[PDB]
Structure 1
Amino acid sequence: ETLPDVQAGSVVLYRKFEVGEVITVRPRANAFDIDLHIKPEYRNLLTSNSVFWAEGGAKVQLNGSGLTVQASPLSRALKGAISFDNLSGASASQRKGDKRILYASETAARAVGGQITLHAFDAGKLAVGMPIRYLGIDIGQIQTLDLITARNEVQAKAVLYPEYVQTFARGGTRFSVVTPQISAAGVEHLDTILQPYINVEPGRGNPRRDFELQEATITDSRYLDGLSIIVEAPEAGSLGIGTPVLFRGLEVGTVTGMTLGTLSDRVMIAMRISKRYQHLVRNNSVFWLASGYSLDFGLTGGVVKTGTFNQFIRGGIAFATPPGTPLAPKAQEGKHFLLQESEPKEWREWGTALPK
């Protein structure tokens, strides 16, 4: 479409190496038509599964301390060169269209694989080429942004790399941008100042390939494997996605999502517990809201407790098991509990033996 590369005479690069030549371009109102020369001993090195991308001029990277000027053929200093490479799923890009298309960047040429669609309410955080990362490892890429004024949403069409398209895009998959959070409590992400991405949490179900972009998503997958109990509450309060679930002050679980009931009288809370602490949850385990700072008072004297709480940052649900000489069976995968509106007075003196 628009490349400042060359009129004629730049070099065809392959894995950043100079073999080939661009011999003819012609401008058009929409898109160039570009003719390349490669050597006859050399035509085996490209096949159907090959993508082409172009760059122009001296690209001085700023990465860390280095400022690397392009050790370039003087062709590229005057007229920007074109690179190419073979890859796995480049056949589907050639099945559409009459011939190959010369992409404007390296990462735009890598965008092959299964193509999903995100329905975001706001594209203020999105960009073309913004990576989709699972556990910090890049699995996908946004390749376009479209505004629809009829349905008030931005449809971002993304691709997933061919290894991950079967494992993801299964429905119940959460997509969310990660924004830098700089507060008085502390900085959470600071790379996302300069390079934002999309965190993704997989799901299990039918291959929908039609998604919406959420607000928050659990970062670590260490709580993905264990049971997913549902906890009923009269109100939400300070509960949110990512709020820790605690046993005796240690973090054993997190709140995955929050929604109302099927009849709107209670807010049910979806939380997951780790595999190591999966056995702590019993059929009789009272839950209560340990949120924020609770300080006491008396008529003859008062004492307070302040503990720089993560509960003050995100109000954590705590639990314990009442003592019984027969132990109740383990809680099932889907089990409904209700909160105690106050902390039980005697759970510090319970000491209920939960083995293994």
Structure 2
Amino acid sequence: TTVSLSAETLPDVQAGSVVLYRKFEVGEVITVRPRANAFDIDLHIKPEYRNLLTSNSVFWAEGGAKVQLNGSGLTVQASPLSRALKGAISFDNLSGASASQRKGDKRILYASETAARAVGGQITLHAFDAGKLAVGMPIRYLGIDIGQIQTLDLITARNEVQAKAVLYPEYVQTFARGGTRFSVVTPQISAAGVEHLDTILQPYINVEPGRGNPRRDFELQEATITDSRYLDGLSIIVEAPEAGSLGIGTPVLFRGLEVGTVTGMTLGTLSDRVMIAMRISKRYQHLVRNNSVFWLASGYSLDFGLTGGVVKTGTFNQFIRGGIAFATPPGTPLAPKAQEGKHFLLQESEPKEWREWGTALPK
């Protein structure tokens, strides 16, 4: 016996199994020494490698012939029978696993490789409905996998679901800094068209980063659409009497070109006006001014003629998601740029002069 182990549950571990290292075989498991409360596992490694063995090492266990799918994959490694018959143990060093050996007496055998990387990077979410969440669900940023949900805990004292997820140690300091918005993505089949196609197969969690204190306690927000594409933009609040056909994902239009989208919809402080939160992209941030009137351009408007009736149908997005359109009135002194927070007043009718304005906006 060269290095011992401890664990609470031993589903896979079988005596006589082979010790792996980077999916390569060195060492041997010899003894499962049982206890009533917490079982003990003993390992043999060679006398040269135990000098190479570091106190910053973690041991993770896996067992059985695993065919992994992982999209379009089936391959099984060059494997001995000792994994095929008995539950194996692999190991590797990492940087900051010294704290797991400072606490307790001996090392712990993690149930898989995922729980072996769950030191320091483990965060906790709070969701009202775990109908979209799943164990093994990846947390993605810009479509790059930076984390994974590993468990789901239901609480009936406070009726909500605590999902504890992990982050990889490169991104544990960059993310989880407070003001971080975790949001699931999901397919939508409704009056609003769908943009997410892969989420029918495998849903993930989009994330917005933030800056501040390392909180590591988060709330899962609703399924948001604006956050993924239109980011780090100029946030504009517009007040309206009605909602109308507006919604999350409704485009903001300038001469028919989509310059931004609506982030969210909320009642006002006093319940007389709804506020519609939108973001304009950085390339189009300079377009809005302090004198930039909005108007609701939602759905089809056509004029009847008595002698003869001229009609036109664009089949545009504002039928499905009724957009807000704007233009700047002409002024030879130009009003300054819009601030990070500014309240606009929506006009109910489209002002007729908007074709003939022609306000020069440079850069």
User: What's the TM-score, normalizing by structure 2?
Assistant: 0.87
1:222 touches 1:274 (CA, 8 Å); kept in 2?
Answer: no
Report what 1:23 is aligned to.
30
Q: Deviations over 1:116-153 (max 9, x none)?
A: 32111111211233221111112222232221112111
**How many residues are treated as equivalent by the alignment?**
356
Could you tell me how far apart the structure 1 residues matched to 2:186 and 2:34 are?
41
Q: Deviations over 1:84-124 (max 9, x none)?
A: 22223433444454433322222232233344321111112
Could you tell me how far apart the structure 2 residues matched to 1:304 and 1:86 are?
72
Q: 1:298 to 1:210 in 2, by over 3 A?
A: farther
2:20 touches 2:27 (CA, 8 Å); kept in 1?
Answer: yes
Q: 1:88 to 1:221 in 2, by over 3 A?
A: farther
How far 1:227 moved relative to its partner? 2.0
1:288 touches 1:318 (CA, 8 Å); kept in 2?
Answer: yes
Q: 1:46 to 1:301 in 2, by over 3 A?
A: farther
1:258 touches 1:267 (CA, 8 Å); kept in 2?
Answer: yes
Could you tell me how far apart the structure 2 residues matched to 1:304 and 1:92 are?
74
1:216 touches 1:241 (CA, 8 Å); kept in 2?
Answer: no
1:165 aligns to 2:172 (yes or no): yes
Q: 1:239 to 1:29 in 2, by over 3 A?
A: farther
Q: 2:192 aligns with which of 185, 199, 202?
A: 185
Q: 1:59 aligns with which of 46, 62, 66?
A: 66
Q: 1:49 to 1:291 in 2, by over 3 A?
A: farther
Q: Which moved more, 1:23-32 or 1:155-164?
A: 23-32
2:247 touches 2:321 (CA, 8 Å); kept in 1?
Answer: yes
How far 1:185 moved relative to its partner? 7.1
1:325 aligns to 2:332 (yes or no): yes
2:13 touches 2:61 (CA, 8 Å); kept in 1?
Answer: no
Q: Deviations over 1:144-203 (max 9, x none)?
A: 222111211111222333333343333332211111335697653333333221111123
1:207 aligns to 2:207 (yes or no): no
Q: 1:243 aligns with which of 250, 267, 275?
A: 250
Alpha-carbon RMSD: 2.7
Q: 1:260 to 1:313 in 2, by over 3 A?
A: same
Could you tell me how far apart the structure 1 residues matched to 2:276 and 2:102 are?
47
Q: Which moved more, 1:67-76 or 1:233-242?
A: 233-242
Q: 1:244 to 1:46 in 2, by over 3 A?
A: farther
Q: 1:232 to 1:39 in 2, by over 3 A?
A: same
How far 1:57 moved relative to its partner? 1.7
Q: Which moved more, 1:317-326 or 1:217-226?
A: 217-226
How far 1:341 moved relative to its partner? 1.6
Could you tell me how far apart the structure 1 residues matched to 2:113 and 2:165 are?
16
Between the two proteins, what is the percent identity of the paired residues?
Answer: 100
Q: Deviations over 1:59-91 (max 9, x none)?
A: 123355543234201111111321122223433
SS in 2 for 1:210: coil
Q: 1:256 to 1:97 in 2, by over 3 A?
A: farther
Q: 1:191 to 1:86 in 2, by over 3 A?
A: farther
1:5 touches 1:82 (CA, 8 Å); kept in 2?
Answer: no
Q: 1:158 to 1:354 in 2, by over 3 A?
A: same
Could you tell me how far apart the structure 2 residues matched to 1:271 and 1:342 are?
20
Could you tell me how far apart the structure 2 residues matched to 1:32 and 1:301 are?
90
Could you tell me how far apart the structure 2 residues matched to 1:51 and 1:18 are?
16
SS in 2 for 1:220: helix
Could you tell me how far apart the structure 2 residues matched to 1:292 and 1:113 are?
51
User: What's the TM-score, normalizing by structure 1?
Assistant: 0.88
Could you tell me how far apart the structure 1 residues matched to 2:136 and 2:333 are?
58
Q: Which moved more, 1:145-154 or 1:80-89?
A: 80-89
Structure 1, unaligned runs of 5 or more = none
How far 1:298 moved relative to its partner? 3.6
Report what 1:42 is aligned to.
49
SS in 1 for 2:48: coil
Q: Deviations over 1:258-277 (max 9, x none)?
A: 32222222222222212211
How do residues 146-295 of structure 1 correspond to structure 2 at under 5 angstroms? Answer: 146-181=153-188, 188-218=195-225, 223-295=230-302
Could you tell me how far apart the structure 2 residues matched to 1:272 and 1:157 are?
31
Q: Which moved more, 1:220-229 or 1:169-178?
A: 220-229
SS in 2 for 1:75: helix
Could you tell me how far apart the structure 2 residues matched to 1:53 and 1:95 are?
18
Structure 2, unaligned runs of 5 or more = 1-7
1:314 aligns to 2:321 (yes or no): yes
